Design a binder for this molecule. Structure first.
Ligand SMILES: O=C1[C@@H]2CCC[C@H]([C@@H](CO)CN1Cc1ccccn1)N2S(=O)(=O)c1cc(Cl)cc(Cl)c1
Length: 127
């Protein structure tokens, strides 16, 4: 399935090159620009655990998720991954716990030492 593919075929997008965040582009976005620190970013996403459980989805809420890029409002892998995305891009991320919730997890939804899969669609961003 998709998590397998990004695990096996994804690009390491970390600056450390520690394979902690892997990415594949599912839909190529529009224009070369990518969001920058402080930008208000609007996305749709779905997140799955390594047992296939879908732990969250913005689509299921009929409204996007909004955050300010690069400010630590989200897990590290999102600040890193979303910074790579073009407007309209759909990407998959496969994230080791060091770039997500670590050994603590985030109860009740995210267990300890959880590798996370996301599909993210970047709808828009603005300074
Ligand atoms: O950094 C996050 C990441 C990535 C952005 C989308 C969501 C938001 C919105 O739920 C939560 N956060 C930030 C955050 C804030 C507070 C506690 C834990 N995490 N998540 S998430 O992994 O899908 C998530 C979804 C849900 Cl329902 C619960 C948790 Cl603990 C985490």
């Amino acid at each position: 399935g998709a998590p397998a593919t990004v695990t096996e075929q994804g690009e390491d997008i970390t600056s450390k090159k520690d394979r902690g965040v892997l990415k594949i582009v599912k839909r190529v976005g529009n224009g070369e620009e990518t969001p920058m620190i402080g930008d208000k970013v609007y996305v749709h996403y779905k997140g799955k655990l390594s047992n296939s459980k879908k732990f969250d989805s913005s689509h299921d809420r009929n409204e996007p998720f909004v955050f300010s890029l690069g400010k630590g409002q989200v897990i590290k892998a999102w600040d890193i991954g979303v910074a790579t995305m073009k407007k309209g891009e759909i990407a998959h991320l496969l994230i080791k716990p060091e770039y997500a919730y670590g050994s603590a997890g985030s109860l009740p939804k995210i267990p300890s030492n959880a590798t996370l899969f996301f599909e993210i669609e970047l709808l828009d961003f603005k300074g």
